[PDB]
Amino acid sequence: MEKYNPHAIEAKWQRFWEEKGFMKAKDLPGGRGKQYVLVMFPYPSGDLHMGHLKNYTMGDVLARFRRMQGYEVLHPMGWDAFGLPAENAALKFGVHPKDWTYANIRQAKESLRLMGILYDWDREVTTCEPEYYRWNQWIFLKMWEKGLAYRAKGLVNWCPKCQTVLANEQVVEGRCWRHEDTPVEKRELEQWYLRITAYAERLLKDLEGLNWPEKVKAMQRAWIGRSEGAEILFPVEGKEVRIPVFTTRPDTLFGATFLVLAPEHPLTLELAAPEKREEVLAYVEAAKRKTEIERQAEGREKTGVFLGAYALNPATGERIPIWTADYVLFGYGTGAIMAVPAHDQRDYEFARKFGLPIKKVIERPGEPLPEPLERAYEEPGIMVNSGPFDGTESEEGKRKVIAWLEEKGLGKGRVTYRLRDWLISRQRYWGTPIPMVHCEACGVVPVPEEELPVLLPDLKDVEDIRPKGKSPLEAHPEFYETTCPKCGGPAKRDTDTMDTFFDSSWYYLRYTDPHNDRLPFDPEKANAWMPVDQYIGGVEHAVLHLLYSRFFTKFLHDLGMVKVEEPFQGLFTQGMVLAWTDFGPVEVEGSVVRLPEPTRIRLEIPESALSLEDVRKMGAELRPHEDGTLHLWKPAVMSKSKGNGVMVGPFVKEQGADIARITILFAAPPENEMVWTEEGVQGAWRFLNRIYRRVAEDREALLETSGVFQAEALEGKDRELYGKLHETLKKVTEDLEALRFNTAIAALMEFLNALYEYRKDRPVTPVYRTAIRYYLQMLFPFAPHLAEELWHWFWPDSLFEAGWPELDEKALEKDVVEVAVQVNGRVRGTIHIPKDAPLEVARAEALKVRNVRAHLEGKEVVKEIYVPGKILNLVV
RNA sequence: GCCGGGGUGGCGGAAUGGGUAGACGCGCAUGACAUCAUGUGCGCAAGCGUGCGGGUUCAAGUCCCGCCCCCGGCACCA
Ligand SMILES: CC(C)C[C@H](N)C(=O)O
Ligand SMILES: [Hg+2]
Ligand SMILES: [Zn+2]
Ligand SMILES: [Zn+2]
């Protein structure tokens, strides 16, 4: 009997599929129903290890499966080559972006191949290639003609390291999404913006009937931050200008004891009295250089400064002082807020800090508010000290005060969103050029459609493209010196480049027509493949990619190019992958595990000594090491940085693909985080082995046996197996359609074990033949090699043309099941009787069990509950 | 503090229209020549066992009431 050998069959079969062209997506899916399985394309930066493969595998399992079922599958793959992620990688290794990009793409593309993964590469797409970004620019123009793209000056986020501006969504915890060790800063500058906010309502209203992870949906709702309320106009004293503010508590208007303007608000300086004019300019610019991190380090000791001007409370008419404090966001509402310390803990704290007035106008139902208040009372209540509103309820009060302000023309009801606009212009070389020219006479002029693409200046000098503070294209007149396509005089091309997230925002749409030189894609085509039925990815693109794509699809929908309005119908979010990591040497002494500083620091814990127990309790262990000392190991995220990756190729060579697949899809539940391990792999070896042995050993017999027969005529073990078979066929089919792989696999390990047992007694019957035909077909998605291999010992064509096994309902039916006999609620034993056996039969069969405990325990019995399914309770 | 999801074996994890808890796998332990085969929730035992405390029921991981700890999210309203 031969043995299972990966190398001998793996690469073999891989070529076979590639050449046979099975996962080649059709152009316009017929009435066969389509399936668009797609995983987020990668950032060509770094080598591919196992942690990275978890997502593509699943997409492969899924794609293969759907393919067998007959659906027209589209399982594209490509590269998110342009932007900061890539360029920053290259620049780190002093390599030229274009070289570094095509280097990874080559490697990465090999790994995937070495894994059994099949794409329809006739659709590969590289974002940084002119053939692609050509269209980023064509889109950008169409957005401009619809006034969705524009320029504007103001403070923006700046990443010193990246040496460019970042969108708000690229500022995770006031730090760069890439350099979580670099505190983002603020700078005055004029950039480009996409009016995503013009889609704030739809972007929210459509999240409703969506089948996505709660976590994601939640986050977007918070990022969009819709907030119903009112815009109130406070007349400034002496001047003509009226200052507007936003609030959700118009019912506390009489509580307004002072206004507050954002340090960057226009009037903050145009109102500050001369004697203060200096103190304001000092603080205004002080709040600027203050990084978000620095702000969030003050707690509630917020700062502020009195301008020197006053305003009139459009409700009472009294003169309230006007201040300015960083806690107010120029980018939110109207950069101005009416302060009501009595009903807002943030304002309250401020008021009490700078000796400002606190005035209650909302009374708590029942137990009166302790005067003087010691804390702002926010909850609803009754309106007091509020002119003609006294005795009204906060709730009804609002719409009233609103309708009121609206009548007097002092304010209006208005909805505002937290969502700020999208800042896409970037000061980096490696990126799409913004198709705009800056004529001196006409101003900002768009490049003609046909004059596209605006090719990127070829710069083969690393030390040149390196960002120093402004677009590298600024020192290249050969590029930025052109003529205005409007008047004709001398103009200047835009030196800034679109951000990476601009191209990743519609690729899924590009794969549907990867070679279109007239349009970014043919509507007819994309309409036949969208939306994306399944979308494997990660949650780190919650407010980013998953946000922007929705915008872009809505925009493209309005141009009438895409019929849907939500790109990703389904969306899975796989979990991290960990791996036992070496943390360093330790000094064991009995039970005391003293830690040398280098190790401790790596563990990142305050303790400098632990007990053999704590080391265990924290999930670590002590191993012997090549340096002849004891090292401490403990899982950790598998990453290059950690140097605990498990390289795809170096692995498949020594082990196998299918082995890595199984070890990955059975480690734990997909969404959970697994821990790649030796034992994990060893187990996959054994599972794959036995699958092989079993079919090998009955190969000859199988060949001379026919797999045809009449099910109803089956009896005994035969009939038994036939059930267990379809029992499995069902669990497996469902588990797949629900992305629950671990169990689909185990469902197979279990039937395998079933097949072995069946041989201990029964020969090699037709049913058994069929049992293998089905086992293989089902195994395909997980171990496509070993399956195709064994499958050919008895069948001609590839598993790809076998179809998915048809489940047989009638077969799932039980007869003579195993009921459990319990005495007085406690399970005393079990018996074997039909699913229909009447109480009399069960009672009987039970009264004489192994230990006849049902008898020794039931020497009285009163009531007897009997669930024909599997229960018989003898209530003593 | 609010919101979503979670606490099950030495380990990852199965099973909730109440109805042999712990499938499948790992690990361990014996029997055979790294691998198969058998066993493996805990306790010597009475007996006990799905985060804690009550309760409903012949029967509770599943249902009711009160509560703790964990993970993730937190814009507005309340
Ligand atoms: C779909 C893309 C936005 C995914 C992103 N390029 C990444 O690989 O992290
Ligand atoms: Hg390129
Ligand atoms: Zn950065
Ligand atoms: Zn001009």
Side-chain angles (χ1 to χ4, degrees), chain A residues 439-443 445 484-489:
Chain A
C439 163
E440 189 190 306
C442 310
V445 187
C484 164
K486 191 173 185 177
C487 68

